[model samples]
Each structure stands twice: as C-alpha cells, then as structure tokens.
Target: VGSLNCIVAVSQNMGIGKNGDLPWPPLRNEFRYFQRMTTTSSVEGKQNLVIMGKKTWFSIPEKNRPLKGRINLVLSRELKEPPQGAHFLSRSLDDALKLTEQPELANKVDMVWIVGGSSVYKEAMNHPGHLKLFVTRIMQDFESDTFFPEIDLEKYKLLPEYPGVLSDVQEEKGIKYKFEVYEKND
Candidate 1:
C-alpha cells in the first residue's frame, strides 16, 4: 500500500523536455514545490524516494545529483552500476518500487515519486502501484522533443483541490502555471 506518485511540469501540449532538458526557463517557485513535495514526510525520521531515468539523473547538475534529503533511485538497464552520487540503480520502474518495499527500506521511505524522462513516465503511468500525479500544467506551449504520455481519464480523475497544493494559477517570470493533482480511481 505504498503511495507511488509521479510529478511533472508540462506545457500546453504536454511537452516535458527539449533536447534532454527542461523546455521552459526555470521557475524558482515551481522548483520549490517539487522539493517540498518529494522531501516532506508525515512520519518523523522517514524520507521519500525519488526515482528517475538515467538521462533525467544526468540532466541534474553534478552538485545537485542526488537531490538532497531524498533517496534517489536512478533507473537504467545499460548502466553497469549506480551513477556517482545516486543512492541506487534500478533496471526499471517496477524494480525501483520493489527495492523500496524491502524490509530495510520499507520503514524509511514515506512515498515513492516517479520523476522522469519519457519512457520512465510512461512506465510509471501504467504501473498498478501508481496512485497520484502531481502535474504543473503550464498555460503556454513550448517547443519540445520529449513529451509526457497522455493520462487515461478513464482510470484517473483530476481532483478539485488538494491540501498543501496551490490550485490557483501561479505566475513567475511572466509564465503562468498551476499545480494539479490527479488521483487514480479504484
């Protein structure tokens, strides 16, 4: 019964990245939201898990490689070992989920976040354990080579509101975006 969630910031066209990097300019507040969500835990002394694809891991600056205060699981089949600074290496999304379920990690991890690249996001979206999607829907469109997969509305529904999340449109550096939470209906 772990909470496996996926978080992303997408443009109007569901574009996530361009040339293996974020398409739009960095929004300081948006980044803060990501940090707050993934690092916060209800249980004291427990941290959360942040899982991402190999490319996503590398895209992060070397100084911020492991994404401080959270357990970082980098998914990669070809990589012989976990990259430097990463806590672990998982072959796939399912593998990452199971790793956290292990006895040694189970009690320490409060939640599982699928932070991404295209394929990893695709896999987590269809995974049975996936529960929620924390999406920052940008009001504008941008050119992007990578895209987030379409959400299956039949299985997931956008929630009207969620605690600790800003539902109203947020403007930063003239870019308007809103945080939205979608739950998978059982």
Candidate 2:
C-alpha cells in the first residue's frame, strides 16, 4: 500500500520486458527521456521515489544502481546485505510504504517511479494506498515475455486528464503512442 506515483511504458499487450533487462534494442532518446521522467523532476525540485525489489535493484550494475537524484528504496529480508546506495530496505513492499506514512519519512517522499519485474508492479496495481499510474502505450511489439498487471477497472479508471500528468500522444522513431495515467477509484 502506497500513495507514491508510478510511471510505466508498456506495449499493447502490457509487456514491459523479456528477461531481467529491457528486451528491445536501444531507443536512446526514448530511453533517456523515460529515465528523466521517472527518476528526476517529473514534479520538479521535489524528492521523488524509485522503488524496487532486491532483484530489480540488483539487476542494475553498481555504477548505475542507486539511480540518480531520487529516493531509491529496495525490498529485501537479507538484513546482512551490504549497503550501497539504496535509501531504504523493507521486509516487503508494504512495509516500505508503511514507513513512508510514518511522520519521519512520509514528509520526505514526493512521488514514485515505477519499475519492471512482475512482483513489484503486479501487486502494486492492487495496492490500497496506490496513486496514479503513468502508463505509456507502446506501438511496436517485442518478443516480450513479462507483463505489468492489467488495470483493474474495479479499482482504477483510465484518466483522460489528471493533474500533474500528461495526456498526449507521442511518436518516436515512427512508433506512435500516448501516455495515460490510471486513477484509483476505491
């Protein structure tokens, strides 16, 4: 459960990746733009969150791991793991968000950056404390084998217009798509 913002770019089938990494060949501008959107000042000048499971966190080489100027939070029960750059650790993702609600830490978070890999994104689609989902529709299909959970209409509705979120179709390298944010209703 969390109120942190999440950003996503998925194919029509909601495929995000094939292995532990991006499946498609490099989309330099597309890739860099997304990183800046999710990691940096989507809100601009505030502390945004980038949460991930331990595996997701570790997949990044030590060089680029902590991500950039955002709060990088990770979930892990391996209390023995040595610290690198992750800002917080949780027994589970729920606990991580729970702590964010605590007065001491809640004030530190401004937004959340979504991540790939099933467990984190899948369960978050159903979180009670969930916030808006910045989903980018992908036009070109890849040999994807992973998926972010579909939007649950029982809880979330696709927003044509949401404050602090963009609703514009975009084209990159001939691939046409748009960004939509899902708002939780219940």
Candidate 3:
C-alpha cells in the first residue's frame, strides 16, 4: 500500500538534469540533498518511487530518464505511452498513486517521494492530507526562470538540521546550502 508520507524537493535554487545530476555549483552537496531525502527512511530491500512531471522527465537526458534502482513515475497531461523503461506512467498524480497502490505493487515499496518542477509540488502541497517538505536553501542567488511556489511560512514548522550536513561546495561555484525540513502544523 502507499505510504502516508511524501518527500518533495522544491528546487528553490537548482533543479535536476537529465542524468539525475544537479546542473549547478556545489554539485556534491546538491546530490547529498537528494540522497539524504530519498534514503531518510531506509527503504532497503523495498521499492522506493519518485513521482515527477513530464517536463521533469524530459529535462533529464533521454539516456538517463528513469533514475536507477528507484521506480520512476512520470506524470503528463499528454504522454500516452509510458517510456520503455519507466516503471509506471500516468496522466496525473492520482493516476500514479493508483498504479503504485495496485494489489500487486503493495508491500513492495516502503516510501514514495515526489520530486518536482513546480506544478507537481504545488498540487501535492495542496492535497487534502498533510505533507512534509525538505527544502535545500542555497546561499547564493540564482537566476532561475522556474521556482517553487511561495509557501506560507505560517503553516509550517521547521525541524532542526543535521550538523555539517549542509556546507559550501567551493568547486561547484562556491555555493552553500542547508537542508531544512518543514511539516504542516495541522
């Protein structure tokens, strides 16, 4: 069955590339952000899935579209045929969840992570139930044409950060970042 929890990455500063790489400075730290979030609950020996929009899938180079190990789910308003290797594809988030929770899929995964490009995160955030978010705040300002939707601070409480888990990647454009987790109060 589907886990009640969903980990969403709101790229305030950078986004993922076609090959699951961060296309900005502080590359190592950026990836750690993904590793930390995806592995937070230790889904070892169990399936872990990440849901994203069509744009997010296309952003990744064709060669690296479906991220390895984890089940890749692509949601599109128009994509009819699921890509060759995608574990699952749907026209919407609801459809994706249905596929993930099918009887055959139950008991196979421990968690579901929703990685996004904006609209997907926005919809997940506004869903009926409560959700948790892990936001990576980078020190330097970036010129991103896309952005995470502005969240209402009053609705979320930030949890403590792990020591030294956040740092500057001097080689990756001198970017400094920290992981901040937030959950709805009610």
Candidate 4:
C-alpha cells in the first residue's frame, strides 16, 4: 500500500552509528532533509511512517521524540506497548509492515520509512515490495561500531538522479557529504 524506504546517513566506511548514536556531529541540513522526506505526504490527509529499532528510537533525544510530524513505529520484542513518545510498537520489520497494512493505517499511511540501528535496516534491504534507499553519504570516515549493510548492486540500482533529492555534494561543519538514492531494480 506504500513505498517502503530506508533513510540513513553513512560514513566512508559505511559506518552509521557509534555508542548508539550518530557518529558525526549533527548536520542540520541533512537532518532537515530527513524531516521533510519522512513528514511530507503525497496525500493531504495521510502521513508517512518512520519505523525504527528500539535503540534508534531511544537514540533520539527525548525532547525531539516521535520525530515531529511523522507516525513513529518502534520495533521491539520486549516492549509490550509503544514507548512513551512513539505511536506504535511491533516485534519485527514484517510485523511493523503488517501493522501498517491493517485497516486503521492502510489508508492513512502514504509511505513507510525505515529508520534504523542495524538489523531492521538489514531486513528492509531484503524486504519484498517497492523499496528505495535515501542515503546521506558522509565523505569522510569516522569512529563507529555500527555499520550500514551493503547494497547489493545486483538487486538494487543507484539512480543517477532522483526527484527531491540533492545530487551535488554538500558541505556542513567543514564535512563534505551528498545524498543518493538506490531503488530495487526488479
């Protein structure tokens, strides 16, 4: 019913996080881009959904929780209910997908965005359905313990350009970066 997308910022070594948080200093514009991508819905009354793993859910600072305008779904097997600021809780990626397909959400959700820690992202990469990756490629390497999964070029093709995504390299905090999108070819 919705496009399942994965959004993330990664380093030269494909590092995504460290100490359960972003490895690099905050990149305001990149974050703003994320906000817009997840919050904007094609349908006037519908909203996009941001699905995250438990750690990624908590990694967000308390003050900015639920990530503003989008519907938030936190994936966790231990939690019996949604976290304080989140809207929903599911046991896995498939479970979360099924939840959104339920009558209550199917019509209200315009898109499903997978925000992440590790495993959820991995699952999304293999997920069946229309899937794309919105990636912010950090031009430099950083100290990180968590890494992004490899994009299987055989299965997904990097778009030369994508609508609403910046194609040029950007600089912030003296760090060079750029946005790229990859879609499942089949």
Q: Which ten residues in a row have the lowest lDDT in candidate 3?
A: 9-18
Model 1 quality (TM-score): 0.96
TM-score computed on alpha carbons, candidate 2: 0.80
Residue 87 displacement (Å), model 1: 0.4
Q: Backbone clash tally for model 4? A: 0
lDDT of each residue in 3-98, candidate 4, tens digit only: 889999999998999997898999999989989988888888888999999999999999999898889999999999999999999987888888
Instruction: Estimate, for each residue in 59-101, the C-alpha lDDT of model 1 and write its tens digit.
Output: 8879887999999989989999999999999887778778888
Per-candidate TM-score against the hidden true structure: 0.96, 0.80, 0.78, 0.97
Predict model 4's lDDT versus the native: 0.90
Candidate closest to the true structure, highest lDDT: 4
User: After superposition on all CA atoms, how large is the RMSD of candidate 2?
Assistant: 3.1
**Whole-model alpha-carbon lDDT for candidate 3:** 0.65
> Which ranges of candidate 4 are over 4 A from the true structure?
none
The residue ranges of model 1 lying beyond 4 angstroms of the native Cα positions read: none
Q: What is the RMSD of candidate 4?
A: 1.0
- Over 4 Å off, model 2: 39-46, 162-168
- How far off is residue 14 in model 3, in Å? 9.2
lDDT by residue (44-63, candidate 3, tens digit) is 56767788887777765677
Clashes of 3: 4
Each candidate's lDDT (Cα)? 0.88, 0.70, 0.65, 0.90
